[PDB]
Symmetry: D3
């Protein structure tokens, strides 16, 4: 639900920024 | 790293599809 | 904040699915 | 269409960066 | 620019759906 | 597969940051 979406979004977003900078 | 990115992407993607259908 | 994020995510997600199918 | 996709993407992207930094 | 964004989005979106279903 | 996903993600992510800053 909303919790899983918000939590998963933040984790993914941080990992994605890391990939963009690699 | 790559593992965290791939894993987090799949979790987020599934949650996002769930949100779009809600 | 959280409201804008959730709302914008749903709008984007729906538009993105539309683009993928075009 | 393309307009909605581009507009919604920018709004979402800005909100997502905000969430990542929160 | 806009072309690269639109093109890259579609490619990514299709690949992402593929990952979600794997 | 995984290669296409990772490559397409990085390209999209960079283009998306560019759009957010435009």
């Amino acid at each position: 639900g909303i919790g899983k979406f918000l939590h998963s979004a933040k984790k993914f977003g941080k990992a994605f920024v890391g990939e963009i900078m690699n």
